Design a protein around this ligand. Structure first.
Ligand SMILES: OC[C@@H]1O[C@@H](OC[C@@H]2O[C@@H](O)[C@H](O)[C@H]2O)[C@H](O)[C@H]1O
Ligand SMILES: OC[C@@H]1O[C@@H](OC[C@@H]2O[C@@H](O)[C@H](O)[C@H]2O)[C@H](O)[C@H]1O
Ligand SMILES: OC[C@@H]1O[C@@H](OC[C@@H]2O[C@@H](O)[C@H](O)[C@H]2O)[C@H](O)[C@H]1O
Ligand code: AHR
Ligand code: CL
Ligand code: NA
Length: 447
């Protein structure tokens, strides 16, 4: 579990997990004047990790304005920071730059400017990221194609070294879809996650307001990534505003991994209100958040929806049907495999509504709704403040009935002796007496 937000007033978050046992976190600060860095042995530990300013804007000329979207990478024994910056003369003449350090600790180490990342076209450029596919390092970034009437398109290239591309860039996406062209016609913030022999390049689209969202390109890892034909663009956003959870304009993401290395983590920013207040560039309230990526059966990532503030939700799978998860459909609770609408299968465990050390299970996509029983059937329904609802939505957490060590079972608070159990895949509360009943009433959280 994570507690969101991770950091207030930090946009364009980048987190890098190093082999020294630390996560390193950099981001865009509201002043746009410097590159900050913090570190911690765990992801949650980053929330209270102190920042060091590692580099500050130049007093005059290039690298002197709009210090935007730093990423930190460890490459061939050295640290590299990728960032964007305009000039004091022309604040909107934004280009891409790199810093290098050979120090073990990048917080305290000394940094060297490696200069601008050169590209054949001299145009607005930012959001450089680097990644390796099958021993070949690539750079992906956002840049204006001057022959297109838009803001930025996505480019990719091979690299000669961490600060220089090799050969010619290829344009692999341009903003053309309705959801990419709201306010401004933008593809920016590329980020790469790899899974199942596929390469998924997420990116941000539209203006940086509530319309901000993630798109995604997909390619095979065996394909020529410099051939635009290798990439397939998702026709709809893969991550967007959720009014229900009060999360607006989620975007400019990166990817990291959990403490145990086994789960992929989506790192992004958003706001908790819709309408921009004041000069859009100057609204400082974007905050950094974390949530686990779930992998669809078809090998594609499922980002779900930006989750409610506070503790993150979990998924509950069945003991006897390990691929089936508790989910709601038309508000009825069932167990089901291959949940495409991920958030129907996410619930957060909260202090019981009926107190006395019980727990309740709050819907991730319908905050304020809970798993509750009525006529012994389990539904996801809105808390109305009634005693009946509170009682019907509270359970005693028990050791699993088929797995005392690792499983979980849920005993009704108002009907002791009855447990949450599935029957013909639908969830009910019933007494447990047989081996099969015990299995039907045992679940696992995050397994
Ligand atoms: O996120 C950076 C950028 O901000 C918005 O574009 C503003 C536009 O960019 C300059 O080239 C022009 O001077 C200014 O009108 C978009 O959200 C994105 O491209
Ligand atoms: O469980 C609540 C909600 O039901 C599912 O959506 C229901 C489905 O959507 C309409 O297009 C159909 O008329 C209706 O059956 C969601 O998956 C879930 O959040
Ligand atoms: O909830 C799934 C399963 O339903 C109940 O079994 C009833 C019937 O018999 C099984 O062979 C089929 O899976 C099902 O249609 C069990 O109580 C429960 O495990
Ligand atoms: O948040 C600062 C800039 O705005 C975003 O649109 C760009 O990706 C980032 O460089
Ligand atoms: Cl589904
Ligand atoms: Na980035």
């Amino acid at each position: 579990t994570f507690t969101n937000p991770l950091a207030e007033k930090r946009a364009d978050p980048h987190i890098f997990k190093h082999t020294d046992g630390y996560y390193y976190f950099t981001a865009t600060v509201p002043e746009y004047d410097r590159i900050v860095l913090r570190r911690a042995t765990t992801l949650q530990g980053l929330a209270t990790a102190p920042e060091t300013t590692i580099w500050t804007k130049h007093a005059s000329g290039v690298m002197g304005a709009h210090i935007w979207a730093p990423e930190i990478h460890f490459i061939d024994g050295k640290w590299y920071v990728y960032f964007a910056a305009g000039s004091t003369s022309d604040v909107w003449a934004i280009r891409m730059y790199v810093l290098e350090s050979g120090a073990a600790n990048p917080l305290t180490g000394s940094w060297t400017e490696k200069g601008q990342i050169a590209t054949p076209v001299s145009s607005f450029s930012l959001d450089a990221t680097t990644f390796v596919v099958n021993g070949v390092r690539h750079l992906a970034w956002a840049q204006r194609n001057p022959a297109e009437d838009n803001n930025t398109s996505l480019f990719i290239a091979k690299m000669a070294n961490p600060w220089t591309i090799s050969g010619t860039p290829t344009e692999i996406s341009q903003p053309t879809l309705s959801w990419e062209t709201v306010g401004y016609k933008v593809n920016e913030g590329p980020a790469v996650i790899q899974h199942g022999g596929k390469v998924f390049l997420t990116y941000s689209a539209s203006a940086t307001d509530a319309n901000y969202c993630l798109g995604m390109l997909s390619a095979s890892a065996s394909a020529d990534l410099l051939n635009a034909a290798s990439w397939t663009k998702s026709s709809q956003p893969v991550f967007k505003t959720s009014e229900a959870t009060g999360q607006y304009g989620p975007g400019h993401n990166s990817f990291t991994v959990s403490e145990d290395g086994k789960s992929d983590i989506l790192v992004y920013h958003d706001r908790n209100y819709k309408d921009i207040s004041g000069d859009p560039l100057n609204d400082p309230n974007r905050r950094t958040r974390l949530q686990k990526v779930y992998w669809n059966a078809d090998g594609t990532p499922n980002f779900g929806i930006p989750v409610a503030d506070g503790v993150t939700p979990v998924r509950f799978s069945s003991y006897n049907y390990p691929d089936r998860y508790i989910r709601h459909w038309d508000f009825r609770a069932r167990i089901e495999a291959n949940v495409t609408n991920l958030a129907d299968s996410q619930f957060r465990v909260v202090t019981g509504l009926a107190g006395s050390g019980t727990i309740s299970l709050e819907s991730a996509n319908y905050p304020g709704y809970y798993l509750r029983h009525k006529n012994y059937e389990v539904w996801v329904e809105k808390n109305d403040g009634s005693s009946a609802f509170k009682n019907d939505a509270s359970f005693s957490r028990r050791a699993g009935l088929a797995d005392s060590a690792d499983g979980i079972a849920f005993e009704s608070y108002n009907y002791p002796g009855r447990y949450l159990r599935h029957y013909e895949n639908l969830l009910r509360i019933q007494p447990v007496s047989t081996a099969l009943d015990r299995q039907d009433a045992t679940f696992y959280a995050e397994k």
